[PDB]
Write a protein that binds this DNA or RNA. Structure first.
Length: 95
RNA sequence: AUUGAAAGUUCAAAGCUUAGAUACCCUGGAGGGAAACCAGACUUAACAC
């Protein structure tokens, strides 16, 4: 099929989370959480990918190439990333 | 009365074919919900003398 593996996961906030969208003019708060098209909080796949990729590059120093092969090259990308992240959808929020 | 006179560079003809604005890229870093502030002020009235 198109994807070799498809591994969904859940994202559980251990501490509080701030993933920002950066100070719009129509907002009221000046550092709001990333919303989505419907208005629910979300984590854009770009934020997810950058955070996870930096973490992995520092926590698996012997597998950078593997990581680089799957998540993309930082410098001079001769090819696309094999791996894809979807925008993290809000599953359940404490109220 | 001229090495002259006369004679349409004309006709037919698709700038088309194949081709992903894609690849890599964390709204992050820095920043004390603080600063000021008395739970206080005062007895008065009545009649008796």
């Amino acid at each position: 099929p198109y994807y070799a593996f498809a591994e969904p996961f859940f994202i559980h906030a251990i501490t509080h989370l701030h993933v920002g969208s950066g100070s719009s003019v129509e907002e009221e708060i000046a550092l709001p959480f990333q919303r989505d098209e419907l208005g629910y909080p979300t984590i854009y796949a770009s934020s997810l990918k950058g955070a996870i990729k930096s973490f992995l590059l520092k926590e698996f120093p012997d597998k950078r190439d593997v990581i680089y092969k799957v998540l993309g090259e930082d410098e001079n990308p001769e090819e696309a990333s094999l791996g894809t992240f979807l925008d993290a959808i809000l599953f359940a929020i404490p109220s």
